[PDB]
Structure formats: structure tokens, C-alpha cells
RNA sequence: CCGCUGGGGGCGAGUACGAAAGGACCAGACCCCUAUAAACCUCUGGUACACUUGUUGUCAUUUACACGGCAUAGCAAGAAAGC
RNA sequence: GUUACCCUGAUCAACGGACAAAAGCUACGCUAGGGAUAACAGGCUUAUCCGCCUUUAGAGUUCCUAUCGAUGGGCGGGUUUGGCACCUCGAUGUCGGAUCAUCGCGUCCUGUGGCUGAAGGAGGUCGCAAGGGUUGGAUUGUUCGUCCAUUAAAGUGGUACGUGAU
RNA sequence: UACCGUACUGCAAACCGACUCAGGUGGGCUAGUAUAUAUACUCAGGCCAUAGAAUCAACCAUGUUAAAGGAACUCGGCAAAAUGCACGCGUGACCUCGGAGGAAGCGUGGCUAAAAAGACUCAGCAAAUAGCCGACAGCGACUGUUUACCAAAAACACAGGAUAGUGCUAACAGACGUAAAUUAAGCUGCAAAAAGCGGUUUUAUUUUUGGAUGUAUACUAUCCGACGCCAAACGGCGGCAGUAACUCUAACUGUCCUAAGGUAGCGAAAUUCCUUGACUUGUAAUUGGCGUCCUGCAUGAAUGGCGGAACGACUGUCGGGCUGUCUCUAACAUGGAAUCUGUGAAUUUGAAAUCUUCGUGCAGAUGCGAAGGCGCUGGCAAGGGACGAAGAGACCCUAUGCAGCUUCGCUGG
């Protein structure tokens, strides 16, 4: 068994885990977003776009 | 001693070598899926509560769970002649049910599931009430049943339905008649005092062959939703400390109703 | 400066000896073997993949004549140089 | 109650007497160090070991010295078992054989000389000599050991009890 | 009859692995000989770009062949070799009657023949694909599961059995500061000029975690692990010194602390120090097996005792066949290595212009002393040394050291 390939990509799972709405659904996710804002990150979440 | 309604599997391979299964020719009318409005399709649980962690262990997997609406009170079918159409075998209970069709005068005929006593032949008519018969499958009040005749599906508080003696091939016996108490021997050799307004389905529950059945292999009991157990001494001390205590809640409100314990 | 010259059994001797059975020192040389070392392919064998013969399946083959590809050199047998 | 004086009270015995009280395991272990503390072995020693004697009382059908050594006394080696902990823990293959080696002689054979209780044979020692030879495998993880049967013989050691950057 | 997707790639040079990475990645469609999606050659279609060029190094990897032998090799036939297929015969013990079993072992095969037969070939399962077999034991009933990255097993599980708890708002396992929201019917009641607000019982809809829309033939926990034949709670089950017409066992009696001193049926056994246990066989030679015997350092009905069919990528042994494992290696094939051209790292490194022996020495010296040797520098090889390199943890000891686990260590609601 060769390791190293733990990242199996999937857009549904990526948006459903680290998206905006699961971050906003819980209070501590909202303080995660708030300290992302206080640090000054250009990308707030993995699914943000314009 | 060969019992009539068991399929004795020949020892063709290991696994079917020591396997005994119930014949569905003794119960000839089991054939057919569960009735489409008396049954639903609920998801299996796996032994996990609303939190999602395991509360009951060694459970999970198997056939899709189908639940059946069994009427354990027979309160709204009192005084109604119900002809038993067929007997059905549910995997969720040890004893098997009986489909009964009631035809009331002002309403269209409907079907209900009740537990099957020993004398149901898919042709009998069941009746429930103060004036009901003493033939098996009738629901009578505890005052109207005799002393020493076997009874099943007993209630504890009236209006709730039958909760006692309802497994396969089990029955209860009334031995005494105290005006509001009626001492009854529960199937564990325990005497309990049950109120006379409670009801008893007279007869004896079917599926006596349940004791003689033998799943010959791990898979046939695993396919019923029973995941394998692990012995306590097979672990490290963090998981279990390997490698005579009565646990009933004392000072309970039900001590007043029991004369002797489970013997 | 390196390597460095090994032995055993016969013949010598049915013997000098020795009542007698029982049998040598000499290896001095000849005959056999066996090592070790150094070569060589003359013999005997092994191998030999652009050699010769036979054959199976299949693809090509306006002849399912000959020839060609692949299947471990397809397989099997027999070979000369070289080793 | 506060303060002094006169006094008392622990096998506080871990006896200059831990903060109340008070046991283990780690072959699952983790960290920091130590060659300041051991094992695998190199260094020092030689009690135990092994060779050389000396005294040699005696045995040897007699007779100490063909041959053996009883008791004491020593000299040499560190290949036995030990003693020390001097060297490496910023971790270093030994307790095996498979291949391939080199050296010493305290020589098993081959080459040889003396004493022989020496019929030459066949032996026992003792003196010189290390050129090259010491093979089979069945059984044991055994370097220990037998016993199958052949040879002239089936040597004992230094080799970090030779040899895993083969 | 709008909006979004439509390029390209998709067993891969475009995804997941730091890479143009020998790894991992789902579904569907398909031609002939031919017969199965297996096997050999081929259709449609695709490919022969990512180092090239010759040649006889040694050596390494992977194979072919090998005279006479044949496990003699080795801890151990490990690894190779060998049987490998459809039609016929046949076909053991033991056994849960199913199996063992494809037991073992012996014939018959391509090609031509509108056909009673034949040809020649060394060879007709002709090339490729398709079990080595038998016997004695040990352990585990079986198929399965198990340490991703050194262990697939005798470990775990298993069907079954035994025990203990559980009478239902069950036990057991979890959330914890405590469960209630909206109508309806009935019985009502208060002062009162023709109506309002209440109290109580029942019912309806919700909301009320698994076990369970289950209920002592059911659920949970523990132990043994099928089936067959004769305190199933932790867990064991002693000594002293003598008594049977020749030596020697101690059967019944005599004693001491003591819960009790281990039955028919076991034993140098997974486990017995003496040890190469005496005994038979096994081999020419046996310390590792098999079957007896007794002298049980330190065995034994629930730590389950007594053996069995079938099963096992489990363990120890014997025969047949087979062959380079071996006696003892040789030739050949493919691909590295060696030569050339092109691309082009890393481990390591106080500075070096780094000889041998003996001695000395922080006790094994390239560097010190004495003596000697040596034109200089490389390629291709072998690795004895540089206490080669690779980890400031293999083992031991220490710390005001940590960590987890255990308990008749201490203290706590
Ligand atoms: Mg895989
Ligand atoms: Mg990653
Ligand atoms: Mg020639
Ligand atoms: Mg030729
Ligand atoms: Mg072609
Ligand atoms: Mg050559
Ligand atoms: Mg102290
Ligand atoms: Mg203290
Ligand atoms: Mg030492
Ligand atoms: Mg692939
Ligand atoms: Mg990688
Ligand atoms: Mg790839
Ligand atoms: Mg092809
Ligand atoms: Mg190319
Ligand atoms: Mg031959
Ligand atoms: Mg063939
Ligand atoms: Mg199978
Ligand atoms: Mg298995
Ligand atoms: Mg019970
Ligand atoms: Mg090449
Ligand atoms: Mg020196
Ligand atoms: Mg040179
Ligand atoms: Mg070189
Ligand atoms: Mg300390």
C-alpha cells in the first residue's frame, strides 16, 4: 500500500465541507470566518468566486 | 425427533451441515409481500441514537427493514367479526402475525395485523368484547377469562394495548382473582397483579418451532442485522479490564404488584 | 621478488628376520591411480538464436504449389567453427 | 484572648527530622544526558587454566629415571573461567558456516635421528623439521559431541575465539 | 419552447501520488479462425517521442539447454524442474454417510478417408492456455477477519451451549440542572332581566434518543467455542516417616499446619531441569517426529479433560516421480554493466602533499620514535582498513524527567 494520495478531489464534498454555508451554520465556524477576515485573507472560503 | 414444520438441511457442505430452518408449508399462506398500506419502509438504525454514537452494540446490516402496523389493543374492532384471511411471517418478531379483514356495515372492508394464536387456520372469525367466546384468538377482559387457561398479549394499564407474553410460543396463566388485582403467573415464573379491566388475548402464541431453529452459519444470523461480538478478555485494559449483582431500580413504583420474582 | 617440488598401492620381497604365525626398512628407479598447478581442443561429450530436416495453429497466398510473419529460436531432432 | 516563664508530646530509627496522606508496571514506551554506571571487545592482571621443569617417595614380576608421576617449590602465555572499569553509548556484527586467506609450532601425516622391556613388523616416548596435506556427510540453531568408513592423517591455536560497505 | 454543459484529456505526459512517477482511478461497445470476454494469430482502429550508436569484458538480473548421478545441497528439496487437457476404464482406509475423490493407477487423441482403412514422424494433450501425488502426527470444527509500511497465524470471529441481569417509562448505553404546545366533548359553577369567564375528567394533533414500532422461545453482559463419548463466579486441589513368605513399590493403616489435598479418563507433552529418559521401529549413521513405559523441576470437565470426517498460502516428519539446489559447473539468449555522443544528481566533507612493520600512546596511529620502502597520474575490478557513511536512542544507568496502564497505594461526592 503506497500512501500520499489522501486527497481524492470532489466538488460536492469540497463545497459541502469548507464552503460558506457550513461555516455560517455554526457559531465557531462564524468566528473562523471572522478571524479569516481579521487576518486579511483574499480568499475567504474555498467556493468564493465572482 | 423430526418435527413436522422444519426444513432439515442435508449436510451437503459445512454451514448447511447443522442447519435447521422453519418450513413455510406448515405456514402455507406466508407467501406475499407485506400489505402496501399496513406497512412502511423505515431506514435501519445500526444501533446508533439521535447523537449518532453506538448505544446498543453488535447490531447493523442485513435485509431492508420493513415495519408492520400490528394492533395490540383491538379496541376499535370490538364486537366486529374479523375473518382471518392469511397468516404472515414477519422477520421483526419471533412469533408470526395473522392478517384479519373486518367488514363493518357502514364502512368499506379493511385489514389489520394481530399476533397469531395456535388455533388460526386462515379461515377463522375472531371476536373481541365482554360477551366474546372462549375459543383461541378472542380478546376478553381478565374477569371473563377462566383460572388456568393460557392467555397472551396482556396489558398492564388499560387502554394501552397488549405488552405481556407476546413472544413466540409463550403464554401467561391467571391463578387467583383478587377483586382489583388478579394474580397472574408471567412466563418467567413471576407472579404479577394485573387490573381486571385489562384484556387478555385467549390462546397460546404460535411459532413453537422457534426454539428448534438453527442458523448453521455466521452469515445467516449476520444477514438478520447482527454484527459479530468480541469477548472481553481479547483486549487491552483501556478497552475492557479483561486482558452476581441485581440491577433492577430499587424503590420503584411497581414493587406493589409482584408477589414472587422471576424464578 | 613470486611460485616452489603432494602422496598411496605394487615391483623390489613370500624375503634379512623369524621355532612359528607374522611380514619390513631404501623410494634408489619402473608400473598404475589420485590430487594440486599450468595449459590444449587431438579424442570423448555439452552448448551453438541469420545452419539442415520434420511439423501444429493462425495471418498473408486471383493455386490453400513453393516462399514469408508470429506463437520461448513456436516446437522437436541433428549439426561445423568457437568456448 | 495576647505575651513571657516553668514544662510535656513521634522507632520524626531515612535519627540536621519534603511541602497533609501515600504502591507498582512498561518486550508500546517518549525526552535529556553518561563511555562519570554495565553487555557484545580492545587495554591491565594471572587467582583459576595451559605448557616447561625441579624434588623425585614410589609403581613398573626385581631395579626412580623404557614408560607414568605422588607431595612441595618455581618460570613462561593470556587462546579458559574470573577481577578492574582505562577506550568508544553524537547508536559501531559478536555465541554459526559459505567462500577465500595469512602466520606460529606445543607435528596428525609425509621427511627424519636417539633410547628402547628393540624378533624387523607394531608400538611408547624423546630430538630436528611448518614445504604442503588433513576428505565424507547422517543428527543437533550448536563453534560443543558422537558414530556411519573411507585415508598417510581426518592437528591445535593467533587471527576484535579471521572474514555481513562479499 | 428559455438558462447551464458542449474545446481538449480521460488506465493517463493533462486525474490522485513533489515528477513526463512501472503505483491507484468508475461505467459501457465490439469482428474471424473458434469455442468461453481464457489462449495463439488477426479485423475495425491505434501505436512503434521523450536517450541514441556499435561490440566478445568481468560481474548482476531474467531465461534456454546440458553427459553420469540425483536432496548427496541446505536450518528446512527454499528456488527451479515436474503433473497440468477433453473421451473410456477404474477408484483406498477413515467418516458426522455428505465426503475423502479429479483418490491412486491404465488406455485414446493430430493428418487423409461420402467414410470397413491407412500414410510416415524421433515426436501426433505436435505450438499457447488449463492439479504433483500418497502416508504419519500437532493446533484450530468449517467459509471468513486481523497488525495500511518486517508477523495472516495456533491469534479474533463463527453457528451452538452455559451462567447472570431484565415484568416494560425494562435492563443496558447516551443528552442532562426536571418536558410539555394547540384544539374538542362531557360534568359543571358565580352573581344575576335573555350572557361572559373559569375548575375538573376523557379524547384528537403534535412533541416524547437506541434497545424497539421488540418484550422472558425476547433483549443485554460474561465465558467456552461445531458436533460426538463420559465454584461452567476469581482459581487451586500438601507433607512426615514405616507396614506384603529373595531384593524393591506402600495398595490399608500411624501423625502435623490445613478451604481442600487433582477422579474413570492424561503425560519428557506447545508445555519434564536431569536428557543423547532406558523400549520397538525409523537411517549406514537421528538430540528434530511418530507408537509404549514411568521418576508431573514447573499437567489435567469450563484456565473445559478423551479422540475422530472434511477443511488450512498453519507447523514437524516419511516414500514415488522430477530436475543444475548439489557432486562441478559449461555454452547460449535477453537487459543492465564496460566504449562513444547528448542530458545530467546525491550521501559525504576541519585542512591534507594521507606508505609498511615493530614499539609507544585516552590503552587497536597515515601524522609520534626506530628501521625500511616508494618514478608520477589514472581507467576497469575486489572491498581488509580509514574505529567507512547512514539515526545526537539497539541495550544499561541517571534525572525536582514525562506519558499511558494496573492495584486490598493515598485522598476526594
Ligand atoms: Mg492493490
Ligand atoms: Mg499531500
Ligand atoms: Mg575441432
Ligand atoms: Mg551452422
Ligand atoms: Mg503479422
Ligand atoms: Mg565466458
Ligand atoms: Mg532523610
Ligand atoms: Mg508528603
Ligand atoms: Mg573484557
Ligand atoms: Mg494501470
Ligand atoms: Mg511519491
Ligand atoms: Mg502513470
Ligand atoms: Mg499479435
Ligand atoms: Mg525509441
Ligand atoms: Mg540424462
Ligand atoms: Mg499442447
Ligand atoms: Mg472455499
Ligand atoms: Mg481461511
Ligand atoms: Mg432469566
Ligand atoms: Mg547491453
Ligand atoms: Mg600500533
Ligand atoms: Mg592501479
Ligand atoms: Mg574504480
Ligand atoms: Mg529523582
Author numbering:
A (entry chain A): 231 to 280
B (entry chain a): 69 to 311, 330 to 349
Authors' description from the paper:
Here, we present a biochemical and structural characterization of the mitoribosome in the model green alga Chlamydomonas reinhardtii, as well as a functional study of some of its specific components.
The large subunit (LSU) was resolved to 2.9 Å, while the small subunit (SSU) was reconstructed at 5.49 Å and further refined to 4.19 Å for the body and 4.47 Å for the head using a focused refinement approach. Reconstruction of the LSU revealed eight additional r-proteins, named mL113 to mL119, plus PPR*, a putative PentatricoPeptide Repeat (PPR) protein. With the exception of mL119 at the exit of the peptide channel, all these proteins are relatively large RNA binders composed of repeated alpha-helical folds, including a mitochondrial TERmination Factor (mTERF) protein, several OctotricoPeptide Repeat (OPR) proteins, and PPR*. Fragments L7 and L8, the largest of all, make up domains IV, V, and VI, which form the catalytic core of the ribosome. Surprisingly, while it was anticipated that 5S rRNA should be absent from Chlamydomonas mitoribosome, we identified an RNA density at the typical position of the 5 S rRNA in the central protuberance (CP). This rRNA density could be attributed to the L3a rRNA fragment. Proteins mL115, mL116 and mL117 stabilize the 3′ extremities of L1, L2a, and L5, respectively, by binding the single-stranded rRNA fragments in their inner groove. The LSU reconstruction revealed the presence of a specific r-protein, mL119, precisely located at the exit of the peptide channel. Interestingly, the membrane interaction in Chlamydomonas is mediated via two contact points. mL119 forms one contact, and mL113 create a second contact point directly with the membrane, similar to ES-H96 in yeast.
